[PDB]
Amino acid sequence: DLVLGLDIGIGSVGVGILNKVTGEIIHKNSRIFPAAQAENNLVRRTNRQGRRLTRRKKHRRVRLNRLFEESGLITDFTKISINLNPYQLRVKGLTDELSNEELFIALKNMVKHRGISYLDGDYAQIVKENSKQLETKTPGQIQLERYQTYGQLRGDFTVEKDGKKHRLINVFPTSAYRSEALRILQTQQEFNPQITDEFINRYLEILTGKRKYYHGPGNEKSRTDYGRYRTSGETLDNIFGILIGKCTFYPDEFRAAKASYTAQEFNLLNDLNNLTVLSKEQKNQIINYVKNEKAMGPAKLFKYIAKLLSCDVADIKGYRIDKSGKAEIHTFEAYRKMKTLETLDIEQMDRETLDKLAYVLTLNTEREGIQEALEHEFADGSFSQKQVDELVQFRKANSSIFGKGWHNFSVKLMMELIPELYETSEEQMTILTRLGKQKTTSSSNKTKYIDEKLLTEEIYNPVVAKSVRQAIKIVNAAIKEYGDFDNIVIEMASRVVLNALQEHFRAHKIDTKVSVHHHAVDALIIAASSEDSILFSYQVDSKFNRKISDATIYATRQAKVGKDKADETYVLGKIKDIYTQDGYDAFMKIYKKDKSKFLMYRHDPQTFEKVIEPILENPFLKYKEEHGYIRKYSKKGNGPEIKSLKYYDSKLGNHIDITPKDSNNKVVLQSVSPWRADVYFNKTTGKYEILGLKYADLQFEKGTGTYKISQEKYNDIKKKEGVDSDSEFKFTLYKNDLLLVKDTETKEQQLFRFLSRTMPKQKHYVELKPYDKQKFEGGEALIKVLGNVANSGQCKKGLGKSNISIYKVRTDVLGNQHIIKNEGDKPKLDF
RNA sequence: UUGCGUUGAUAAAAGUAUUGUUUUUGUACUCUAGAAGCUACAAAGAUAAGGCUUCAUGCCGAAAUCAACACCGGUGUU
DNA sequence: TTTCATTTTCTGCAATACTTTTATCAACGCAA
DNA sequence: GCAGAAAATGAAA
């Protein structure tokens, strides 16, 4: 027999298999994986909600077009001018008549910009200032006056006053926009007859329509799995209600609300069973006294207990104590605060309907959720309208009683325990032990190996779950290839994996004691506390929908730059905020490199001399403190301000194209990300051909909607990347899929990790990463057919040379190599 | 191991707002009613490439899952 | 004798202000 | 950290 030791880091797990009787090393491995932290799901969720916002904004504008076309006002929306001022139109719309087109433009600009709606520190002060200025005048007048006096209204800006300054923001409450649109539409209804009251109703629905935070996305006919409408066919009416946890002894029932009747009964009965001096009659009497007396605290109930016992408060153990505080026990605070209603009584209703009413009032917060839950939950309830409105006002007034949370047990278990704790004096622990209910079962079937799923469901962090899953798969494969063990030592929360390992070794009668690169050697050290032959094994990344490129959008111009004698397309750049230190550094870089790369030096060169004078005399902050913003040259000092210039960055190369329909110049995206490669062989010339795909080449198909790459497009990539058609498809390679190259004249070989096919002009180049390390500090010497590594840290040597050979290797989880050389007749393009 | 009070941290999911980059148009600025599309400001369109059917409080797309192949939860090969 | 075809460097990358729910861990006490 | 063109090389013609 033998011993396994196992070291678990953040993003690497290493093994060591040792002998107890001799002291030999049997197997070592250093599996590496990316540590899945939670920045990527935050980026994914953030981008999904941003896409939803932009979607709904564009759909708001389309809904406004359909509203204006179905009421028969106008017909064509490609004739309307876009060179008016809408703010002036809104201010004129307060006073007199506008036509159909003018009103269309005014309401369109008003739909595009509604305001915040969470009202109904340094940011709240300024929107409060806009609200305090808003009381005399409508926000359209605020924006218009800010325009006519300062020339600039959009975004936050700092405006020079006579003694000080202030910062102005464009944020206003949406009730301002509601009142302003109401006054505008009422004046136009005085003047124009075609506006109906249903028109202003639907318009104020569009202008102030936000979905509630418990509705989610969806529709009756949409059926996404994110909102209350669901794919299976059941509409939830609140999405957070399906996320409520389960019981601890009946794992098919949800929890009970903490402000119900049975929860407060169970809590008071356990709290008075806890106390050390009671009988069944005194329990019933004390429960009736807490139920019927009004405005009591803990000390009043303790004085009533001391009256019923005729003894002083002395040697009374079992009272719950709060921090630096006197005795506090459970009172029927929720029941009594619902007894202070007047529209409906509580004392004679039921026990069932009080539990369901407390569930409804605990879950929903707003008016509509509470009203719809009262109408949909209560079969044969039939509440009246003033009862419902008093219930909503009661929930809104008391927000601490109904915002405590949910109990642990269900109503079944507590209703079972209640009649067995009136007679006896036992707490819930001894009653649930005596009755045998201790199951809380959760398991899954297996025969000979450990299952990762039922252990991994203990979630602390995703990184601990990922590391534990890789360790359990290693233990599985070592058990498969070596039979059984005699000791397993695991060194990294750890109590759950310890308990699962001991449970699996207890249930299958194995007597193996479970205990508590560089990591392989430290795993050997840990296995003792019970190299060239270090073999590695990486994790292959073959997911095909990651981030396709960068985010910035670029503009292109056709201009001769430098020592060129032809017209090519250059990609523009832009220095923003020329008065900052970084803008001045970038300006001096492009100035000392080549002054003709700016666009202000070609068109309107005279003002560049005006820009020449501050650099010749004195940064531009000195000129701003002297005289203000640098102006474009004019006869007077009426010149426009200068804050940003444009230059020519570089030529155009590999790109994605998003060019709009009416555009004189190509609009691109850059830095596109690669997916996998396809190594081909040419039999005539005797060389290899390395094709390469990117994420932006796969796309959704217009017929089905599936995710695949076509055949003609793949042959187009075959022609562009420069492979021959009568060639032999050898294999593919993903990220971190190992690769053995070998020349055929000395027969010396080396194996690397694939990374990416780079530099798409120069053909058959491969970026490749080391077998053991990942850094490549400096240039370490390689095989003589390949050369030396570049002195910056990147390696992008060239394949496709004559007298060389390329084989794929695959390692298993223990790291045993398997060298293969041909996989199929054709690559796979369906997943 | 189970329950009850406090107070911190995290994770999953939902609803909004104002910019930013970029395209067309207008006004100012420049040179001779035109030209140039630089420099400001204001409208309107796009905002990961892309895609669906139900015609709309419409919907999806940046995470995790992993050695492969062949013959009868197991079994063999390179 | 310039010109082209392969190997190395080196710069550059989207943000901010609110509202709400559910679950899980810790530690400080009362109980078996 | 990495996509990739710009500046720097070496081989021919």
PDB file of C-alpha atoms (C1' of nucleotides) in Angstrom, chain A residues 44-45 47 51-52 55-56 58-59 61 66 82-83 87 108 114 151 153-155 210-211 213 219 221-222 224 229 248 258 320 323 330 407-408 428-429 448 466 469 473 540 543 545-546 548 553 555 557 600 603 632 634-635 641 643-645 662 664 702 707 810 818, chain B residues 1-7 10-26 28-31 36-52 54-68 73-75 78:
ATOM      1  CA  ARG A  44     -21.344  39.671 -17.748  1.00  0.00           C
ATOM      2  CA  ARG A  45     -24.305  40.755 -15.580  1.00  0.00           C
ATOM      3  CA  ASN A  47     -23.290  44.221 -19.700  1.00  0.00           C
ATOM      4  CA  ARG A  51     -28.083  46.015 -23.063  1.00  0.00           C
ATOM      5  CA  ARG A  52     -31.560  45.844 -21.509  1.00  0.00           C
ATOM      6  CA  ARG A  55     -33.113  48.065 -25.769  1.00  0.00           C
ATOM      7  CA  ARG A  56     -35.925  49.584 -23.722  1.00  0.00           C
ATOM      8  CA  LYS A  58     -35.053  52.391 -28.388  1.00  0.00           C
ATOM      9  CA  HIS A  59     -38.360  50.588 -27.904  1.00  0.00           C
ATOM     10  CA  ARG A  61     -39.044  55.703 -29.202  1.00  0.00           C
ATOM     11  CA  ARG A  66     -46.714  53.886 -33.195  1.00  0.00           C
ATOM     12  CA  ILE A  82     -34.011  67.603 -37.009  1.00  0.00           C
ATOM     13  CA  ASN A  83     -32.480  71.101 -36.987  1.00  0.00           C
ATOM     14  CA  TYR A  87     -36.508  73.375 -25.503  1.00  0.00           C
ATOM     15  CA  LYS A 108     -39.961  63.023 -28.853  1.00  0.00           C
ATOM     16  CA  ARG A 114     -37.122  61.513 -18.530  1.00  0.00           C
ATOM     17  CA  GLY A 151     -24.494  78.191 -24.420  1.00  0.00           C
ATOM     18  CA  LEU A 153     -26.651  72.514 -21.135  1.00  0.00           C
ATOM     19  CA  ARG A 154     -25.916  68.795 -21.589  1.00  0.00           C
ATOM     20  CA  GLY A 155     -23.964  66.941 -18.923  1.00  0.00           C
ATOM     21  CA  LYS A 210     -40.855  51.641 -15.478  1.00  0.00           C
ATOM     22  CA  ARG A 211     -41.196  47.961 -14.683  1.00  0.00           C
ATOM     23  CA  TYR A 213     -38.094  45.530  -9.503  1.00  0.00           C
ATOM     24  CA  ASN A 219     -44.207  39.274 -21.466  1.00  0.00           C
ATOM     25  CA  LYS A 221     -45.676  35.725 -25.173  1.00  0.00           C
ATOM     26  CA  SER A 222     -41.967  36.148 -24.367  1.00  0.00           C
ATOM     27  CA  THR A 224     -37.676  34.164 -20.722  1.00  0.00           C
ATOM     28  CA  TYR A 229     -43.263  34.646 -16.856  1.00  0.00           C
ATOM     29  CA  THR A 248     -34.531  21.830   7.679  1.00  0.00           C
ATOM     30  CA  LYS A 258     -41.371  35.294  10.729  1.00  0.00           C
ATOM     31  CA  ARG A 320     -32.319  35.754  26.728  1.00  0.00           C
ATOM     32  CA  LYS A 323     -25.725  43.088  24.598  1.00  0.00           C
ATOM     33  CA  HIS A 330     -40.619  37.260  22.512  1.00  0.00           C
ATOM     34  CA  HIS A 407     -38.195  31.552   9.832  1.00  0.00           C
ATOM     35  CA  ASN A 408     -36.173  28.362   9.637  1.00  0.00           C
ATOM     36  CA  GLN A 428     -37.403  21.881  20.420  1.00  0.00           C
ATOM     37  CA  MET A 429     -33.998  20.152  20.473  1.00  0.00           C
ATOM     38  CA  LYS A 448     -17.189   3.018  -7.103  1.00  0.00           C
ATOM     39  CA  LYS A 466     -13.278  25.085  -8.396  1.00  0.00           C
ATOM     40  CA  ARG A 469     -13.561  19.995  -7.924  1.00  0.00           C
ATOM     41  CA  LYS A 473     -11.210  14.610 -10.081  1.00  0.00           C
ATOM     42  CA  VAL A 540      -8.071  23.276 -22.228  1.00  0.00           C
ATOM     43  CA  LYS A 543     -15.632  27.937 -25.051  1.00  0.00           C
ATOM     44  CA  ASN A 545     -18.512  33.012 -27.107  1.00  0.00           C
ATOM     45  CA  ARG A 546     -16.123  35.229 -25.155  1.00  0.00           C
ATOM     46  CA  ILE A 548     -14.836  39.490 -29.329  1.00  0.00           C
ATOM     47  CA  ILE A 553     -15.025  52.981 -31.901  1.00  0.00           C
ATOM     48  CA  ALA A 555     -12.691  56.808 -37.377  1.00  0.00           C
ATOM     49  CA  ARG A 557      -9.327  59.089 -43.077  1.00  0.00           C
ATOM     50  CA  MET A 600      -5.483  71.495 -37.449  1.00  0.00           C
ATOM     51  CA  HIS A 603      -7.119  72.562 -42.442  1.00  0.00           C
ATOM     52  CA  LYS A 632      -9.694  79.820 -32.562  1.00  0.00           C
ATOM     53  CA  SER A 634     -10.609  85.435 -35.590  1.00  0.00           C
ATOM     54  CA  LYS A 635     -10.589  89.166 -36.259  1.00  0.00           C
ATOM     55  CA  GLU A 641     -12.731  77.481 -27.474  1.00  0.00           C
ATOM     56  CA  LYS A 643     -10.012  71.647 -25.833  1.00  0.00           C
ATOM     57  CA  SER A 644      -9.294  68.664 -28.118  1.00  0.00           C
ATOM     58  CA  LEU A 645      -7.282  67.909 -31.256  1.00  0.00           C
ATOM     59  CA  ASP A 662     -24.679  57.002 -44.841  1.00  0.00           C
ATOM     60  CA  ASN A 664     -18.132  58.770 -46.066  1.00  0.00           C
ATOM     61  CA  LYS A 702     -30.066  33.456 -40.342  1.00  0.00           C
ATOM     62  CA  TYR A 707     -24.023  29.154 -33.567  1.00  0.00           C
ATOM     63  CA  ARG A 810      -2.673  15.137 -24.976  1.00  0.00           C
ATOM     64  CA  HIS A 818      -0.172  10.649 -25.546  1.00  0.00           C
TER      65      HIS A 818
ATOM     66  C1'   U B   1     -25.725  19.133  15.488  1.00  0.00           C
ATOM     67  C1'   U B   2     -30.945  22.400  15.936  1.00  0.00           C
ATOM     68  C1'   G B   3     -33.467  27.040  17.237  1.00  0.00           C
ATOM     69  C1'   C B   4     -33.730  32.851  18.755  1.00  0.00           C
ATOM     70  C1'   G B   5     -31.841  37.879  18.998  1.00  0.00           C
ATOM     71  C1'   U B   6     -28.229  41.398  17.490  1.00  0.00           C
ATOM     72  C1'   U B   7     -23.703  43.342  13.135  1.00  0.00           C
ATOM     73  C1'   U B  10     -19.881  38.022   0.387  1.00  0.00           C
ATOM     74  C1'   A B  11     -22.656  35.868  -3.651  1.00  0.00           C
ATOM     75  C1'   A B  12     -26.911  35.362  -7.225  1.00  0.00           C
ATOM     76  C1'   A B  13     -30.774  37.971  -9.664  1.00  0.00           C
ATOM     77  C1'   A B  14     -33.936  42.487 -10.931  1.00  0.00           C
ATOM     78  C1'   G B  15     -35.415  48.143 -12.097  1.00  0.00           C
ATOM     79  C1'   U B  16     -33.419  53.130 -13.503  1.00  0.00           C
ATOM     80  C1'   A B  17     -30.430  57.850 -14.664  1.00  0.00           C
ATOM     81  C1'   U B  18     -26.630  61.075 -16.769  1.00  0.00           C
ATOM     82  C1'   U B  19     -22.315  61.100 -19.674  1.00  0.00           C
ATOM     83  C1'   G B  20     -18.315  58.938 -23.031  1.00  0.00           C
ATOM     84  C1'   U B  21     -16.759  57.131 -28.319  1.00  0.00           C
ATOM     85  C1'   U B  22     -18.531  57.510 -33.303  1.00  0.00           C
ATOM     86  C1'   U B  23     -21.859  58.868 -38.047  1.00  0.00           C
ATOM     87  C1'   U B  24     -25.089  62.531 -40.658  1.00  0.00           C
ATOM     88  C1'   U B  25     -27.255  67.654 -40.342  1.00  0.00           C
ATOM     89  C1'   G B  26     -27.564  72.922 -38.667  1.00  0.00           C
ATOM     90  C1'   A B  28     -20.945  80.142 -35.082  1.00  0.00           C
ATOM     91  C1'   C B  29     -15.513  80.657 -36.634  1.00  0.00           C
ATOM     92  C1'   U B  30     -11.919  80.862 -41.339  1.00  0.00           C
ATOM     93  C1'   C B  31     -10.913  81.718 -46.852  1.00  0.00           C
ATOM     94  C1'   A B  36     -13.168  73.350 -46.400  1.00  0.00           C
ATOM     95  C1'   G B  37     -15.774  69.163 -42.187  1.00  0.00           C
ATOM     96  C1'   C B  38     -10.672  71.779 -38.594  1.00  0.00           C
ATOM     97  C1'   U B  39     -12.544  74.072 -33.407  1.00  0.00           C
ATOM     98  C1'   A B  40     -17.049  74.748 -30.232  1.00  0.00           C
ATOM     99  C1'   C B  41     -22.375  73.911 -29.284  1.00  0.00           C
ATOM    100  C1'   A B  42     -27.247  71.580 -30.341  1.00  0.00           C
ATOM    101  C1'   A B  43     -30.521  67.852 -32.791  1.00  0.00           C
ATOM    102  C1'   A B  44     -31.163  62.719 -34.806  1.00  0.00           C
ATOM    103  C1'   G B  45     -28.972  57.378 -35.613  1.00  0.00           C
ATOM    104  C1'   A B  46     -25.469  53.154 -33.563  1.00  0.00           C
ATOM    105  C1'   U B  47     -23.350  51.223 -28.905  1.00  0.00           C
ATOM    106  C1'   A B  48     -19.821  44.108 -28.112  1.00  0.00           C
ATOM    107  C1'   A B  49     -20.005  41.022 -34.421  1.00  0.00           C
ATOM    108  C1'   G B  50     -24.831  39.327 -34.770  1.00  0.00           C
ATOM    109  C1'   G B  51     -30.037  36.734 -34.352  1.00  0.00           C
ATOM    110  C1'   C B  52     -35.814  35.194 -33.251  1.00  0.00           C
ATOM    111  C1'   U B  54     -45.507  36.801 -30.508  1.00  0.00           C
ATOM    112  C1'   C B  55     -46.004  43.416 -32.945  1.00  0.00           C
ATOM    113  C1'   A B  56     -44.753  44.519 -27.819  1.00  0.00           C
ATOM    114  C1'   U B  57     -44.571  47.343 -19.470  1.00  0.00           C
ATOM    115  C1'   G B  58     -41.341  42.483 -26.502  1.00  0.00           C
ATOM    116  C1'   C B  59     -36.651  38.687 -26.259  1.00  0.00           C
ATOM    117  C1'   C B  60     -31.404  36.259 -26.567  1.00  0.00           C
ATOM    118  C1'   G B  61     -25.462  37.206 -27.033  1.00  0.00           C
ATOM    119  C1'   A B  62     -18.738  38.960 -22.525  1.00  0.00           C
ATOM    120  C1'   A B  63     -19.781  33.106 -16.414  1.00  0.00           C
ATOM    121  C1'   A B  64     -18.986  27.895 -14.928  1.00  0.00           C
ATOM    122  C1'   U B  65     -18.854  22.615 -16.968  1.00  0.00           C
ATOM    123  C1'   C B  66     -12.934  19.099 -19.892  1.00  0.00           C
ATOM    124  C1'   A B  67      -7.846  13.815 -22.219  1.00  0.00           C
ATOM    125  C1'   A B  68      -9.957  11.785 -26.461  1.00  0.00           C
ATOM    126  C1'   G B  73     -23.143   2.358 -14.120  1.00  0.00           C
ATOM    127  C1'   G B  74     -18.670  -0.594 -15.646  1.00  0.00           C
ATOM    128  C1'   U B  75     -15.051  -2.421 -19.707  1.00  0.00           C
ATOM    129  C1'   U B  78      -2.310   5.691 -28.729  1.00  0.00           C
TER     130        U B  78
END
